[PDB]
Amino acid sequence: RYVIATSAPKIDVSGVSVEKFTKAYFAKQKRSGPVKKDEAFFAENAPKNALPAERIADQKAVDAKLLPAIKAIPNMKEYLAASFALSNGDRPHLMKF
Amino acid sequence: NIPPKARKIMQLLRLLQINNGIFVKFNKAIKEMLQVVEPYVTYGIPNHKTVRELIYKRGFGKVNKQRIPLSDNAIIEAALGKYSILSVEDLIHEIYTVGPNFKQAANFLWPFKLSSPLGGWRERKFKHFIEGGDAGKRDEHINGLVQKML
Amino acid sequence: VNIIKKRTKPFKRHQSDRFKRVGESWRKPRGIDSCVRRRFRGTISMPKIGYGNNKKTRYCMPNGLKAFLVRNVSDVELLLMHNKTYAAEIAGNVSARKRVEIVEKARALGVKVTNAGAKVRSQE
Amino acid sequence: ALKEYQVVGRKVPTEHEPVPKLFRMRLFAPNESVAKSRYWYFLKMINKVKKATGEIVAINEISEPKPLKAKVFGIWIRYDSRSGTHNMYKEFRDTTRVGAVEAMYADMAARHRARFRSIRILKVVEVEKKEDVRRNYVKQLLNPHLKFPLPHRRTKKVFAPHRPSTFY
Amino acid sequence: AQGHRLYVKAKHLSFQRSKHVIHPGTSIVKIEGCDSKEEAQFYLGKRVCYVYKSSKAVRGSKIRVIWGTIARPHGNSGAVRARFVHNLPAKTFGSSLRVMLYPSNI
Amino acid sequence: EFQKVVVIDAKGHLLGRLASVVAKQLLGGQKVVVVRCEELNISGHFFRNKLKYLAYHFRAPSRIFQKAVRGMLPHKTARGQAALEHLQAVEGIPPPFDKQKRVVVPAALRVLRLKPGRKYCTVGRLSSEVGWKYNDIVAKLEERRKVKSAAFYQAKLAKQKKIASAKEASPVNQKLSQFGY
RNA sequence: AUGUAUAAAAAUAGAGGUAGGCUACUCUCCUGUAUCGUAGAAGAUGGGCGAUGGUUGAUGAAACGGAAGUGUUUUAUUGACUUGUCCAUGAAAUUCCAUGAAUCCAUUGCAUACGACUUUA
RNA sequence: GCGAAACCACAGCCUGGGGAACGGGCCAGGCAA
RNA sequence: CUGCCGAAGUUUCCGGAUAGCAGAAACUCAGAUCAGUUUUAUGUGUAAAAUGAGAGUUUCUAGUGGGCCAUUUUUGGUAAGCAGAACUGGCGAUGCGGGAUGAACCGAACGUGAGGUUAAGGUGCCGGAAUGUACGCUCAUCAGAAAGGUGUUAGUUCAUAUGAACUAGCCCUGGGCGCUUAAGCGUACUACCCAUACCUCACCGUCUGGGUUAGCUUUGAGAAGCUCAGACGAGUAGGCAGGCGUGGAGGUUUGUGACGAAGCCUUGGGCGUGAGCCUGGGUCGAACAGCCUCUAGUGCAGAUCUUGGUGGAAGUAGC
RNA sequence: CUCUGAACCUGUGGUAGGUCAGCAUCAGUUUUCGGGGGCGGAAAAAGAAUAAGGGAAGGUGGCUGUUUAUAGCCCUUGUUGUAAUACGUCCACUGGGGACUGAGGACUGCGGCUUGCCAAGGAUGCUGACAUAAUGGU
């Protein structure tokens, strides 16, 4: 619902392994990791959930399987780079996206 | 401000409320009967769809003097089993074809409480239908009207 | 079955705002030519049985509990088996001495006390 | 949405009148029910036959046999005024007989404030001969030199930036 | 500052009302570029919002937004009927309402 | 399309129709400025409108146009009072607005509303003999501004011609003409 | 606030432009869904290439603009930027929406319901 | 300096129409500082 | 304080007894009778088919026991209007949408709410809704929302392309702003706006019809309980019912209270449709309350009410 | 011997209480765009197509007059055909958009799919954020 379906020329995405992408992979980390009742005081237990490398390595593989795909289509790489916006007198119904 | 003679006639027809609707057996006595209530009712010939659709969507029985919806075939046969009416199709057939038990079948259906029509009536409503209003006889034009109140 | 009310605002007496000898307690206006009694536009409402709330929700606090007035510590004990529907209201004249006895007993019993922090003071 | 409905009716047969005569006339009604009611009123005026005394036998609508070919239609009408007794006959050029009829009703309803009940359609005929045409305006529409600019041009998108050209 | 504005500007006209009786539960909104009832079908269901500022600094910011949802069209000129979580104040007549493009059906 | 500030030229516009569209726009929280109000037009010949004013006291059409709107808006309501100040009616085209675009209202244009051969009255001509005594100076400013504007237009036209020739000379133009640009 | 973008006059029942020597021309209109601008971690780091132009900021003022000119250009130089054509990194687990004069005062009669007024001081 | 009584639903621009007075309240109006 | 029922508003004889309306009870029946009903047919009445509704009695007892308006009917009128009787409805006991506003006009008759759609009336602005489409007519130099016209518009008819006589419409003469091939009129067809109305659902109550015990591990026997279904909801006079509150009285809570009773104020929090209630804080300082019954000097906005207090008038009349 | 989920270490094991937004699959009430079709109408009328004839025109060619020419039209048949469209009506035909509701609280019943399962006797899932402020009230 929060995505506008654009009629841009379709890009082959068959190459990337999409099966590993599941609800568990995108699940938010469980509210876990109990701490002993002395470190909560003085605020000396704060960890960081910094993005794991394999999450990037997953994406770098995805980039390695989609970045080669996209440059072949002319202006596609720049088209994704550009940021969508509306000018004055813009009627979303009239101009199909 | 309904005339007293008109109100007695129309209570006899169980049209106690505005935008109500009942089935009437057309006969020689009916024409001169509803002459008094011509500016207060409209009527016409309903096709099988209108007869079917009213009983399905808005057909409520009269079981122990209660407005009991007809959403199961057991209700009709419990009340109209003696007249070989055993399901909704038979009720439609007893109404549409006007069988021997039309008097009992008609009384069993509670007066259909229709709604204000989709799109409303004509610009003016309380004149004769032939005179641009929506009162009085309209023949096969009733079906278009019921499909606005269904 | 959630705690939903057909109206929040109270019913004030007609013309009770203008006068001070006139109390805000709702009194039925019996005036023969009273247009406000006659239900005109721009007037006030009037209590009707149509304003009653759900019979499974009448007497229910916004959190779903029905207030129950406990005088002494004996009363707080009988709410042992209705702690999910009733809340131990502590009477207004119960002294601070028995007020703690009521709150400590009710805490272990599992019941909810509505005015558990009145006249008392915590100490760590 | 007027449409030309043919109506045929006859009185109820009885031992006194075993075979009733067939009365048929073409009248313009927006629906079948209006046509039948108008036919009974016409017969009461002329033959004095009640609705119960008679019955309709056939109702049928008539399309324009050549709706794509322009024609001229002359209608004779009797209209009710303050005196309650008036007669008129008018001519119109249109491609459909119903189109001519609804055109006259608007003209009657404008010039004389004429109601549907008051108007009774007396005669309908097709004008074909050039010499048959009598009215001046249709005469001007008959000569082959019909050429003139479009009248009433006047052509929510409010606040148009430029001044409208309103020309060719 | 070309960019941003993933929404469509709209103006809050008034309430749903008779000649003398007003029901403030629903409000009339005239969306730009909408000029027919058949066209307003596209905007049925979108999320409209009223954005205003205030002196108090709440959560470190100064912006308060009253969300809403377009429900049905209103007449032949592209007006729509929008219901908000809080009924709009009667002072905001003739203001700006931002009709963002979600929930998108396209 | 609506703007924070809108300039509307009153030449060749009906008073009532112009009053209606601005009345709705003013209630819409929009600032509207009306110029050349002296050139507004009212259906009916000159004598009839003269008799209308004689029965009726502000001589300025800018005030008269404002007065017509004032009774055409909820003046008693404080919302109507606030919306009144957002409307600025001035005679001629003042320098603060001469260098800005002047849009027109189709629903008020005489050519789109008046039958040919129908008499009409001009407010500035009508006001000339009722107390207004500034027609010459107002007119004198009009030719002075339009002469300067015409010279500006010629320079803009020459610039437009040069860039149009440059645009056609550009091979990029017809490279992707399939888009209609 | 969200591009907070846009200047002819004038006919409209003919206008405008275009070109020729007011007289003979031609072309466009029939709107703005037009035109301009809108490409980058709000638009990054650099490498270029390519313009070697463009975009502007900063100040140094020149003219124009009486009306309400307070803004339009002209620029002078400098500072950057430049997605104009391209690259390489980079930008994220928030891992589905919520974001100093004057008055009183004194003088003062030129006044005078009373102030005011009236010069002087 | 010493000091009332009467009175008091509440008020107080009109213009007209508002059918029963309506102006002192209602609607159209202007006014309204 | 809430809930239910709720007239009559007048015949008829004669201050009344009747009646009638509304109830309240007792009866007998739905296989019995009915109907401000309609037909059929016999001579408008009468008698015997449909459409509906269960229908009929007896007893005893509150209130009314006026009108206004409108429709109509007549008779006369009588300057002319009109008047006089009637006739039947509506208001009166009744709010809401519309009619600029307005008690009689157009709609629609009312529990609290959500959505939907409408009636009457409306879509230029104020004003919610098309500055809709098609077609004409209106030019007013007072529009508009008896007649005359060197007044037009369409014309007709008759005379020989022109006139005359005419046909009719409209103008001239005799809610605001504005509107003028309308935002005027007239017709037609689309679309839209909205009522306490119509539909669907939720909820409160009322009435009606059920179900429920060898009380079955569904446990739901305060049988005065629990449960199920449907329709319904204006209200004066008046009738019926259930409750809230005050002082005191017998019983009771093995009730509360100097760790603060009663009271009082307070934009603290709650509960109940409501009468009312419970509680937090501040003052306060010696008593008080819930429940079942008993009981009465028991509930206030009025009485030119009694008593006390206090203002404006007013620093006024003034001394 | 069991038990005390008994106290602690041991678990960093497993599930996580209200308020408010989000989407989804459903249900009731709806409003709005569609698509595909059946039957009926002069079996639309037309029209195109279609072999002619005749006719006159506001007359082409010839010359106002004229009759298909160096334009043709109209009418009449003929004409494919069971044309198609439109209109009217039906579908227990189908595909989307949006809003408002969740009353009830084991089990029954009535249906369909095939004991089980289901859109069939009324809402359940996936998630989040807020909470340590949001939602709220005065």
From Swiss-Prot, chain A:
Location of this chain's protein in the cell: Cytoplasm; Nucleus; Nucleus, Nucleolus
Modified-residue entries (Phosphoserine), positions: S7, S17
Family: Belongs to the eukaryotic ribosomal protein eL6 family.
Binding partners and assembly: Component of the large ribosomal subunit (LSU). Mature yeast ribosomes consist of a small (40S) and a large (60S) subunit. The 40S small subunit contains 1 molecule of ribosomal RNA (18S rRNA) and at least 33 different proteins. The large 60S subunit contains 3 rRNA molecules (25S, 5.8S and 5S rRNA) and at least 46 different proteins.
Role summary: Component of the ribosome, a large ribonucleoprotein complex responsible for the synthesis of proteins in the cell. The small ribosomal subunit (SSU) binds messenger RNAs (mRNAs) and translates the encoded message by selecting cognate aminoacyl-transfer RNA (tRNA) molecules. The large subunit (LSU) contains the ribosomal catalytic site termed the peptidyl transferase center (PTC), which catalyzes the formation of peptide bonds, thereby polymerizing the amino acids delivered by tRNAs into a polypeptide chain.
Identification of the protein by name: Large ribosomal subunit protein eL6
Taxonomic lineage of the native organism: Eukaryota, Fungi, Dikarya, Ascomycota, Taphrinomycotina
Name of encoding gene: rpl6
Curated annotation (Swiss-Prot), chain B:
Origin species: Schizosaccharomyces pombe (strain 972 / ATCC 24843)
Single GO cellular component term: cytoplasm
UniProt superkingdom: Eukaryota
Subunit structure and binding partners: Component of the large ribosomal subunit (LSU). Mature yeast ribosomes consist of a small (40S) and a large (60S) subunit. The 40S small subunit contains 1 molecule of ribosomal RNA (18S rRNA) and at least 33 different proteins. The large 60S subunit contains 3 rRNA molecules (25S, 5.8S and 5S rRNA) and at least 46 different proteins.
Chain's role: Component of the ribosome, a large ribonucleoprotein complex responsible for the synthesis of proteins in the cell. The small ribosomal subunit (SSU) binds messenger RNAs (mRNAs) and translates the encoded message by selecting cognate aminoacyl-transfer RNA (tRNA) molecules. The large subunit (LSU) contains the ribosomal catalytic site termed the peptidyl transferase center (PTC), which catalyzes the formation of peptide bonds, thereby polymerizing the amino acids delivered by tRNAs into a polypeptide chain.
Keyword Glycoprotein found: no
Keywords assigned: Cytoplasm, Nucleus, Ribonucleoprotein, Ribosomal protein
Cellular compartments annotated: Cytoplasm; Nucleus, Nucleolus
GO biological process entries: cytoplasmic translation; maturation of LSU-rRNA from tricistronic rRNA transcript (SSU-rRNA, 5.8S rRNA, LSU-rRNA)
Transmembrane segments annotated in the record for this chain: none
Molecular-function annotations in GO: RNA binding; structural constituent of ribosome
Protein name: Large ribosomal subunit protein uL30B
Stretch of the intact protein here: 101 to 250 of 250
Signal peptide (from-to): none
Name of the gene encoding the protein in the UniProt record: rpl702
Main localisation: cytoplasm
UniProtKB/Swiss-Prot annotation, chain E:
Note from the entry: There are 2 genes for eL33 in S.pombe.
Family listed: Belongs to the eukaryotic ribosomal protein eL33 family.
Function: Component of the ribosome, a large ribonucleoprotein complex responsible for the synthesis of proteins in the cell. The small ribosomal subunit (SSU) binds messenger RNAs (mRNAs) and translates the encoded message by selecting cognate aminoacyl-transfer RNA (tRNA) molecules. The large subunit (LSU) contains the ribosomal catalytic site termed the peptidyl transferase center (PTC), which catalyzes the formation of peptide bonds, thereby polymerizing the amino acids delivered by tRNAs into a polypeptide chain.
GO cellular component: cytosolic large ribosomal subunit; preribosome
InterPro entries assigned: Ribosomal_eL33, Ribosomal_eL33_CS, Ribosomal_eL33_sf, Transl_B-barrel_sf
Localization in the cell: Cytoplasm
Lineage: Eukaryota, Fungi, Dikarya, Ascomycota, Taphrinomycotina
Modified residues (Phosphoserine): S96
Molecular-function GO terms, alphabetical: structural constituent of ribosome
GO biological process: cytoplasmic translation; ribosomal large subunit biogenesis
Keywords noted in UniProt: Cytoplasm, Phosphoprotein, Ribonucleoprotein, Ribosomal protein
Main localization category: cytoplasm
Name of this protein: Large ribosomal subunit protein eL33B
UniProtKB/Swiss-Prot annotation, chain F:
Keyword annotations: Cytoplasm, Phosphoprotein, Ribonucleoprotein, Ribosomal protein
Pfam families named in the record: Ribosomal_L13
Location, primary (coarse class): cytoplasm
Subcellular localization, as worded in the UniProt entry: Cytoplasm
SUPFAM superfamilies per the UniProt record, alphabetical: Ribosomal protein L13
GO terms for cellular component: cytosol; cytosolic large ribosomal subunit; preribosome; ribosome
Highest taxon in the source lineage: Eukaryota
Phosphoserine: residues bearing it: S177
One GO BP annotation of this record: cytoplasmic translation
Record bears the keyword Disulfide bond: no
Gene3D superfamilies per the UniProt record, alphabetical: 6.10.250.3250, Ribosomal protein L13 (3.90.1180.10)
InterPro entries: Ribosomal_uL13 (IPR005822), Ribosomal_uL13_CS (IPR023563), Ribosomal_uL13_euk/arc (IPR005755), Ribosomal_uL13_sf (IPR036899)
Gene Ontology molecular function: any one: mRNA binding
Assembly and interaction partners: Component of the large ribosomal subunit (LSU). Mature yeast ribosomes consist of a small (40S) and a large (60S) subunit. The 40S small subunit contains 1 molecule of ribosomal RNA (18S rRNA) and at least 33 different proteins. The large 60S subunit contains 3 rRNA molecules (25S, 5.8S and 5S rRNA) and at least 46 different proteins.
Note: There are 3 genes for uL13 in S.pombe.
Similarity comment: family membership: Belongs to the universal ribosomal protein uL13 family.
Name of protein: Large ribosomal subunit protein uL13B
Origin species: Schizosaccharomyces pombe (strain 972 / ATCC 24843) (Fission yeast)
Lineage per the UniProt record: Eukaryota, Fungi, Dikarya, Ascomycota, Taphrinomycotina
